[PDB]
Enzyme design. Structure first.
Site, PDB file in Angstrom:
ATOM      1  N   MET A 471       7.547  17.555  25.361  1.00 32.20           N
ATOM      2  CA  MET A 471       7.486  18.856  24.706  1.00 32.20           C
ATOM      3  C   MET A 471       6.806  18.812  23.339  1.00 32.20           C
ATOM      4  O   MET A 471       6.039  19.710  22.989  1.00 32.20           O
ATOM      5  CB  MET A 471       8.892  19.443  24.553  1.00 32.20           C
ATOM      6  CG  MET A 471       9.319  20.363  25.680  1.00 32.20           C
ATOM      7  SD  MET A 471       8.174  21.738  25.900  1.00 32.20           S
ATOM      8  CE  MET A 471       7.999  22.346  24.223  1.00 32.20           C
ATOM      9  N   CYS A 472       7.092  17.767  22.570  1.00 28.58           N
ATOM     10  CA  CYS A 472       6.644  17.694  21.181  1.00 28.58           C
ATOM     11  C   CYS A 472       5.283  17.025  21.004  1.00 28.58           C
ATOM     12  O   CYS A 472       4.742  17.005  19.896  1.00 28.58           O
ATOM     13  CB  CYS A 472       7.684  16.960  20.323  1.00 28.58           C
ATOM     14  SG  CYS A 472       7.572  15.144  20.384  1.00 28.58           S
TER      15      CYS A 472
END
Ligand SMILES: [Zn+2]
Ligand SMILES: [Zn+2]
Lengths: 570, 131, 572, 137
Positions: A471-472
């Site tokens: 996600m990051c």
């Protein structure tokens, strides 16, 4: 063995589209405007009875490039601003008034009495053009005709007249002096010698151009007392002839409006619309670009299967933007975006379908609109929808349920599903649904300097077995471009029939997985088997899904252990 | 082929009346400069069948434009096709963009040593149209 | 002795969140008046505060919201003016006075309803600037009445029962004890007998109740006028509770106060400037910057972003390569890009060429490409120049014009740090390769084959250029769509790597040549030395250009045979 | 990571612990409309004050810290907002500002700046992500 003289129509008009494009150009600027056409009387098409009168954009130029023996005929064009006016004008009166200007100028100089006129109407909304040519031929007096009998004994004068008209291109007539030499028309010298030559625009055998009417009319004004003379019709072909002529019986008779294709007296119409249809032009040139890959390079490459493939894209982010761009390039006409997001101000710099002014708008609807903005014929739809991540508790159960149902509807109705999403956990639900619905799947996952591209379609899925697909993760720009194109190239290569006995196709290898790396500039290829214990694959999971439906989905998402225990992976 | 070698052979080709003595040509003309040859041709019977079989339309005439491509230093044949229709009961001609151009045989379609131009004409023109 | 005149702390300390103003802008688009509701937390009060913070947000405009359990709902209103001058010109003492009268008229009916607050405001939506003044009506009837008090520690036993009673009834500001010695809702007949009153205090200051106490006592004097001496309890949810022996004394008329003082302690409106939200350009620029910085601080600390940002990049050609390269450049933070292309946008162009739309057909490519970059990211410094690049092995169409273009091309090469040759064919590569070699500039080459691509770099032992040593770079060549994306990304990745201190960098390897192929999905990396007879690098060719200038170029273009002679490749 | 309901409980405990209320920096401490967020209005430390005068040449009125839970990352996210001290007519004005360099302003969301990502989990998180670079008490 004598006869009365008849005539062929002076000219035969052909107007190139450049003339109408140039006529259009001037309707947006500012009466009649002058025209200049060069006649080639040496080479006349066999199909024609008279020299072709050819109009272009350069016919508006008052002085243009001439060849050596060519004749610069002058004329004018009358452009009406309403079609109704064009119809209601009297043709018989109008051409007569032009003839009067021709008759007037003919007395001053007998060579200025020949011209042409184009009446026109330009409809710029439909790009339709109405034109009518006419040649102001006038017979003065109307009662006076010409009786002629052949005199072949004059054939020695033909060459002298041929080379004379070639040299003097502004001169339409010539006579003989007392020395039997070719000179300009003079009323004095003609009464004595009684020999007149005319440059002929007709190829009709023993039938001179109607223009002759104009010359014989000026002859009778200048020399009223000449009843009998010899007339030379001079042609650059072998069809020149001499005539022994006599006048036999004020009022002027004016003819010479040009007949149409059907021989009726009526204007010509040109339809230049379809130059107004850039959507079709763009469509045809684009497909023709595609066809060039087929005929020139790879003859058995199948384009139609790629054009007819309905493509679902899950996610509108960097990958989705580039993937769709590589798809419309390959000829794919139907693409459906699925994204839950909204364009941020920062988005356009890494996401290739958006602009700064596009911030605040929903991505999915906008990505599809952006495809239509690139290539207006596209079947392109955005769908604002959320894909549930596994390993998280549902935020809105009733809502995600609808979005779950809408995702399956979308997957079933599409041919190939790309998984473009942001994270590993977002791939699971679509991988399961696409498994159930038997759809071919391509994955693309981004790591910092690395990318992953694979096909689900036994080979087994993403889940069948460090910054990659998180996600990051912030990635190098190059990674997304690389992965997007390899995905589409894998997809097009996949739609091709496999060569007998081998894995390869017309577009080459079709590997199971591609994993690229930026730092060392290298591509790895790995082939993985399908697994009986996989969370998105296993018949144990597939039959669990078919039986329990959304309830199996809901529990697997919130408690992956429950899913791992069903698949027998834990 | 050099530009000027092509410019000379274009003027010789034109002056030989080879196109003018063709049965198909309504008109033959060089452009403002001498770089090009515009051939307005009557549709062959075979083409007329084709366009009516495929496009269900009547052919009016064909415009071929013989030009020099300064990119590839080689000749380039351009093609425009016209349709026969009417408006008020009088003939109207219309520039058409065939739905299939390939099976029928600046917006133009384009085709993809001293005897050079005469050969290239026979191959790229006289072959399919016929002389 | 041991007796005092009771003083009062300010009732509330106002904090207006930015979301409150958002809702204020939103409602003005959807003078006047309108109700507000705020939840007081009396159990937890910041030590820096002498009174409970009065905190209003966007949710304050909704009459019924979700309060926590022990919190106290407070009813109030806001008055917005459409003119700044109307706000200034308002008589404040008169306005607050007629709010107090409304609190008084309510207070006599229900003693718990005499407490409210008011906000006057002016919203400048042009500048996104907000003027607000909070006030809390506080009235003394009679104004001549003060309160003499002394401590009463024996009543400390009632503190606990009042805390719990106030917790439960959150709409109630006051309670009394009945004849049964139990805490009950305020009743004027009951207080008359028992003479004990408990008030919910908003102040944290010792022995100094909130000025709101004036409101309640004013109603107490109206309800039981003959009560001179009673016991007053001031109830707090901390150890600060206290009990008083109370007496009303004199020194009808109604005094009014409670306009909140500003940060300076003066009676003035507060002002909030939200204008920075109207600058998305600055927001975007900072967003894009921090995203880049994440690649440094989080992952590769030695990475230099500044040398990339400062790099002036010349793009030769606006085609598929030029469009994808530029996009990947701006993503790396490169802010200065010059496009050089002679073309005009085709109707079919936009589908392979990423900077153009269908509506853009007919426009000059070079300018529009630059114009498109600013449409993506407006802060981009991007220009484009319509320019011809003469092909080697061809006669010159316009000698005069192509001479000018030659001079402009060299000037542009002098002006930029990095040159990309994105041009259509090999024939177009020769001239810029030579010029860049003379001006000694770093060059990246990207050439497309049907299924293949070539990406390489000209040096600064030497590497040697494109010309040093099958459908590749052919200009008649129609290429598979994936090739250009692949080539472009590797072109830029090679560039940013190259700007880093080295033969590898913080970003990985920096090869001389990269050849990828689609059919086997492979990539090769090869080197090559500078060739002696190459008609680009060779000292004889450099010697030739320097001496002869444009006369040498004109000849080498139209007669490449002449070029092989100078280079000494003729003998090879 | 850590479950939404574990963070919801610990936030309310930390709030009710008055550890933020007893902080010398805090002007105000409040939960959002839900109980799932905490907004901290803070007095600027001297060092921050020194930096905004050096770097931005401006005076700092206060800063806002928002402790939020992202249901995506399953982790706490700290949003930050910086306000400038100013004036108009002689009336002191406050202005939300967007620092040219916010990295150097300190020593190290839709409208916000953001920091990037067992019973004692939240209390320890605050120590590292908040109490480290700001003085306590
Ligand atoms: Zn699997
Ligand atoms: Zn070299």
């Amino acid at each position: 063995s004598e006869r009365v003289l008849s005539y062929a129509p002076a000219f035969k008009s052909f107007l190139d589209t450049s003339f109408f494009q140039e006529l259009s150009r001037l309707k947006l600027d500012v009466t009649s405007q002058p025209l200049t056409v060069n006649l080639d009387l040496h080479n006349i098409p066999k199909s024609a009875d008279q020299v072709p009168l050819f109009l272009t954009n350069r016919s508006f130029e008052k002085h243009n490039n001439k060849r050596t023996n060519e004749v610069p005929l002058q004329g004018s064009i009358f452009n009406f601003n309403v079609l109704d006016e064009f119809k209601n004008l009297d043709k018989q009166l109008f051409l007569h008034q032009r003839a009067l200007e021709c008759w007037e100028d003919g007395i001053k100089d007998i060579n200025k009495c020949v011209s042409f006129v184009i009446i026109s109407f330009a409809d710029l909304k439909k790009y339709r053009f109405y034109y009518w040519l006419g040649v102001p031929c006038f017979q003065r007096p109307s009662s006076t005709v010409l009786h002629v009998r052949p005199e072949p004994s004059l054939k020695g004068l033909f060459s002298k007249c041929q080379k004379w008209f070639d040299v003097n291109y502004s001169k339409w007539v010539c006579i003989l002096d007392a020395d039997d030499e070719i000179v300009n028309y003079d009323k004095s010298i003609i009464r004595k010698t009684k020999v007149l030559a005319i440059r002929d625009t007709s190829t009709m055998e023993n039938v001179p151009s109607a223009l002759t009417k104009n010359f014989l009319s000026v002859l009778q004004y200048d020399v009223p007392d000449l009843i009998d003379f010899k007339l030379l019709i001079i042609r650059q072909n072998e069809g020149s002839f001499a005539l022994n002529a006599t006048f036999a019986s004020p009022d002027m008779k004016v003819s010479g409006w040009e007949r149409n294709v059907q021989g009726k007296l009526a204007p010509r119409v040109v339809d230049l619309s379809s130059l107004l249809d850039p959507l079709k032009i763009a469509d045809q040139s684009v497909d023709l670009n595609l066809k060039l890959m087929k005929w020139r390079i790879l003859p058995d490459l199948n384009l139609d299967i790629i054009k007819n493939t309905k493509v679902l894209l899950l996610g509108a982010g960097t990958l989705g933007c580039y993937v769709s761009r590589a798809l419309i390039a390959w000829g794919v006409r139907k693409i459906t975006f699925v994204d839950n997001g909204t364009v941020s101000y920062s988005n356009p710099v890494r996401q290739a379908l958006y602009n700064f002014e596009d911030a605040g708008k929903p991505k999915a609807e906008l990505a599809a609109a952006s495809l239509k903005r690139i290539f207006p014929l596209m079947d392109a739809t955005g769908v604002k929808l959320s894909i549930p991540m596994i390993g998280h508790k549902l935020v809105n159960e009733e809502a995600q349920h609808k979005d779950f149902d809408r995702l399956r509807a979308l997957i079933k109705e599409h041919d190939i599903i790309f998984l473009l999403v942001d994270s590993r956990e977002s791939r699971w639900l679509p991988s399961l649904l696409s498994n159930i619905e038997n759809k071919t799947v391509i994955n693309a996952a981004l790591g910092f300097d690395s990318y992953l591209v694979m096909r689900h379609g036994q080979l087994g899925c993403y889940f069948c077995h460090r910054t990659l697909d998180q996600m990051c993760t912030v990635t190098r720009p190059g990674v997304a471009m690389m992965a997007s194109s390899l995905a589409v190239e894998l997809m097009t290569s996949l739609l091709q029939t496999k060569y007998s006995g081998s894995e390869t196709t017309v577009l080459g290898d079709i590997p199971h997985q591609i994993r690229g790396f930026l730092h060392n500039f290298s591509i790895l290829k790995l082939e993985t088997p399908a697994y009986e214990h996989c969370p998105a694959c296993s018949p144990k999971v597939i039959e669990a899904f078919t039986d329990l439906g959304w309830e199996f989905v809901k529990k697997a998402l919130e408690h992956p252990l429950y899913l791992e225990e069903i698949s027998g992976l834990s | 082929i050099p530009y000027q070698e092509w410019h000379s052979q274009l003027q010789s080709l034109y002056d030989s009346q080879i196109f003018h003595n063709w049965a198909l040509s309504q008109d033959v003309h060089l452009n403002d400069e001498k770089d090009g040859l515009l051939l307005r041709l009557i549709p062959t019977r075979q083409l007329q069948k084709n366009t009516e079989r495929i496009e269900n339309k009547l052919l009016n005439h064909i415009e071929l434009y013989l030009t020099y491509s300064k990119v590839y230093n080689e000749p380039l044949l351009l093609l425009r096709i016209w349709e026969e229709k009417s408006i008020d009961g009088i003939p109207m001609t219309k520039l058409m963009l065939p739905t299939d151009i390939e099976s029928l045989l600046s917006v133009w379609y384009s085709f993809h040593m001293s005897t050079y131009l005469r050969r290239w004409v026979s191959i790229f023109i006289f072959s399919w149209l016929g002389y």
